[PDB]
Amino acid sequence: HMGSEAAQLLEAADFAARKHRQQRRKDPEGTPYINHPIGVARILTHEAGITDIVVLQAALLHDTVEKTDTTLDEVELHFGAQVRRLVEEVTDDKTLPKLERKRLQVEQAPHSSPGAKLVKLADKLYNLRDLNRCTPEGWSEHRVQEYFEWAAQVVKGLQGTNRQLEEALKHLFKQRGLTI
Amino acid sequence: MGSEAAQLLEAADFAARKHRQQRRKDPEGTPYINHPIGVARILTHEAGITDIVVLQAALLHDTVEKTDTTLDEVELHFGAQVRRLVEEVTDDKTLPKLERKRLQVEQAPHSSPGAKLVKLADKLYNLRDLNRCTPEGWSEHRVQEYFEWAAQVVKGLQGTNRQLEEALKHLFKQRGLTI
Ligand SMILES: Nc1ncnc2c1ncn2[C@@H]1O[C@H](COP(=O)(O)OS(=O)(=O)O)[C@@H](OP(=O)(O)O)[C@H]1O
Ligand SMILES: Nc1ncnc2c1ncn2[C@@H]1O[C@H](COP(=O)(O)OS(=O)(=O)O)[C@@H](OP(=O)(O)O)[C@H]1O
Ligand SMILES: [Zn+2]
Numbered sequence A: 001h002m003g004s005e006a007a008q009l010l011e012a013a014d015f016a017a018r019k020h021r022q023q024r025r026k027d028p029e030g031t032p033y034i035n036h037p038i039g040v041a042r043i044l045t046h047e048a049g050i051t052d053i054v055v056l057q058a059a060l061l062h063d064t065v066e067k068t069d070t071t072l073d074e075v076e077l078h079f080g081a082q083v084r085r086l087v088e089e090v091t092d093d094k095t096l097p098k099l100e101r102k103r104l105q106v107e108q109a110p111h112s113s114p115g116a117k118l119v120k121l122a123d124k125l126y127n128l129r130d131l132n133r134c135t136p137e138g139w140s141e142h143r144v145q146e147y148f149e150w151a152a153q154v155v156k157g158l159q160g161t162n163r164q165l166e167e168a169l170k171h172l173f174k175q176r177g178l179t180i
Numbered sequence B: 001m002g003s004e005a006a007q008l009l010e011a012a013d014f015a016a017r018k019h020r021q022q023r024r025k026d027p028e029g030t031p032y033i034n035h036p037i038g039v040a041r042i043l044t045h046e047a048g049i050t051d052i053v054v055l056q057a058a059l060l061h062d063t064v065e066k067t068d069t070t071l072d073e074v075e076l077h078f079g080a081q082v083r084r085l086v087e088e089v090t091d092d093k094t095l096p097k098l099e100r101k102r103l104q105v106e107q108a109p110h111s112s113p114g115a116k117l118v119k120l121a122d123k124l125y126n127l128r129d130l131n132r133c134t135p136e137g138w139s140e141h142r143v144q145e146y147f148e149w150a151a152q153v154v155k156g157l158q159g160t161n162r163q164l165e166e167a168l169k170h171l172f173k174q175r176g177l178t179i
């Protein structure tokens, strides 16, 4: 039947909102986690100039398989194979120890699809801004700076995708003595 | 203002940040932002609504009423038409609760069609939530009383959207209420 991008976008936002409903950010105030995927998708439309509905849905859904009770077939059933494939690309293996997770992001970055690179860039940009705004509960200042150092290693492999996101990230890295 | 997707994410992000410290009354304390998102999703997924102004107003319909949001802030980000719709659906919170509910019944039939769509989906989400899980501290009579008052509001909203009104009619009938 006749669809619309507006309806498709709200499908993904509502899906993510229910999937993340019990989860919270790590700021002291414990912001509802759903604010993060919403803000990641909004970075893509408001700053990066992206309108691709598949990319925007994946941005709203990018942490669902990683962090919630969500399967790949569930994503494909609601949003199609292209969205599922994109969510698959940006989904970390939560069963690895933290260090191996982070190393894989660095290695996987250059061979990411353009859509996956956009999601990964906006994901990093949101979290780096969140760190700069407010040191998370349980994150030492050392851990924050280490996260920027690692994020620069990841963003290094994502470059050449979006001028606005990469210019923004380069400025935030430069403020912390990082080039990449 | 860009694409329709950009305008929806502007309103969803705006609403998410305004309701960031607010939770629903279910025992799990669901983030409040799930409610306006679900109300907007009712409009697109069940009611067939594609009017971007109505969908933004649904995402924003509780911001002025419940959060630190001014009318000028809404119009600054979303324009006069969205602001005017949000105005229409904004309850006076300074009234006692009985008076608040009285006013919704009074104001129902003379709302604009866009405001009637938002109010219908708002009611449908809340009644479905009540059927899903009784709010913390609510007795069964208070749940039934909410349905009885909601039916008085919906009676004034009728003639707006067949899909929304047929669904509300079913939920009312199951509880012995005829609209
Ligand atoms: N307040 C705040 N600021 C920044 N980041 C926050 C916050 N709360 C939670 N998060 C989420 O923490 C994720 C990064 O955590 P870690 O470095 O410990 O692990 S990992 O990088 O995901 O492997 C990162 O996960 P991803 O979104 O999957 O990248 C963030 O979403
Ligand atoms: N779990 C759950 N189920 C149903 N409704 C819920 C829930 N959590 C919060 N709410 C919001 O409560 C509003 C109706 O509450 P009340 O009957 O006490 O009336 S009042 O708001 O105090 O005037 C009603 O406000 P409105 O959205 O303005 O209609 C609901 O949004
Ligand atoms: Zn993320």
Ligand SMILES: [Zn+2]
Pocket (backbone or CB within 6 Å): B035, B036, B039, B061, B062, B122
């Ligand atoms: Zn509401």
